[PDB]
Structure of Interleukin-1 beta:
Amino acid sequence: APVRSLNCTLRDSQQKSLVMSGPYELKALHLQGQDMEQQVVFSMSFVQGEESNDKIPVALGLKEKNLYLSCVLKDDKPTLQLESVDPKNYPKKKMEKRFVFNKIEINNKLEFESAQFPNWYISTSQAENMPVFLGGTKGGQDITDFTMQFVS
Ligand SMILES: CC(=O)N[C@H]1CNc2ccccc2C1
């Protein structure tokens, strides 16, 4: 049948919210109050892929926009991009591998590993107003843990 999707927001474990940074980038910043309306709402789709109790393959589309987070090689490195799709063939159950993240639940937090690039994670910087990126370790100064908030 159809693919199943949930609307949600994400915050990093330092409780930074995600906002648009021009058309094809996200950035993370500390937000509260009125400015919370700026945060990106995701449509998280539950897609085809290798699955276990704590590791669930998802696509992170933007709610009612034909824009997906995707993992591609850029200037020879795994990078995070926002990619446009045909709003007539998405969202689907069999999403292409560049769009798939393994949503991993460890110690009441979420990590989003690239299915295409093992051990590369959706990441934020500690500094305010810096891009969301794909980082090649769930260790060090960069932040790889998130919480999800469910949206109506
Ligand atoms: C123009 C703009 O920055 N809008 C925000 C708020 N709402 C929203 C909803 C879905 C996906 C992204 C967004 C970002």
Remarks:
- Residues 68 and 143 are 21 Å apart (CA to CA).
